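Box 3.1. Reading complex inputs
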Amino acid sequence: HHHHHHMKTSTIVFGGFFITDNGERIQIPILENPNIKEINNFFSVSNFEKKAGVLVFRIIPEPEFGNTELTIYFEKGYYLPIIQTILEDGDIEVKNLKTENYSGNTMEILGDVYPIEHISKNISIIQDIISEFIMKNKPITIMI
Amino acid sequence: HHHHHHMKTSTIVFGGFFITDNGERIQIPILENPNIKEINNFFSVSNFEKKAGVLVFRIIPEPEFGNTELTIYFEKGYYLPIIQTILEDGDIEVKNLKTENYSGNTMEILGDVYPIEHISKNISIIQDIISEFIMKNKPITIMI
């Protein structure tokens, strides 16, 4: 079973959706190859801390190795970032916020229960995670 | 690290995008809790065999065990379905079309190279895979 990934023809695609208080799922307009300004603009105009939903930054088509997706679940100013990545041996792994020790404290995000060490309330940190993910995974060989 | 999934508050979300010949990525309107009629309608009005892109059926928020996503990459009548699932031991695994033997023959879909045993040209089979995925993973306790 032989998958060969071609970076040059792949892209990062940003999307996701908001969930309203009455349960509507509202699509976030798709952005191919998002840049930092565009993502800054999105956080600036969404009044994010009152909203809920999921953000997705996905590499399409999926690479054979390395990061495949950054997912951020969010609800009313609580943010849960998750990176999926493929290790050198092919195993699929999930990365969360770095955690020294688990307290046992939890909270609910989008109805599911997560350890609080995996959740941040700091939008700046979330934007930095997104920027790092774009810098790491954006296929941009073009010099202009 | 304690994730507890709640099925009742989760949903299947359908979306994705088309890729045009000149490289535009056009979002597919999001559908929460898609039913078979809606998906039949989508294949009926998309003239699918000339188009390219990616379909996604994702369970949000992701469960702790079982299927998490059905992704279908497609290009000009060639379809590549992939299911991601979480096994009882927590390992993340990918499922493709059942394959007895690999020939070594490949083709390109969306720029990446895949074994032909993982690709179908039969839209009916793809629709059946989607129906099975919805029947397996749709959280619908309501009897009416």
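In summary: The longest helix of chain B spans residues 123-137.
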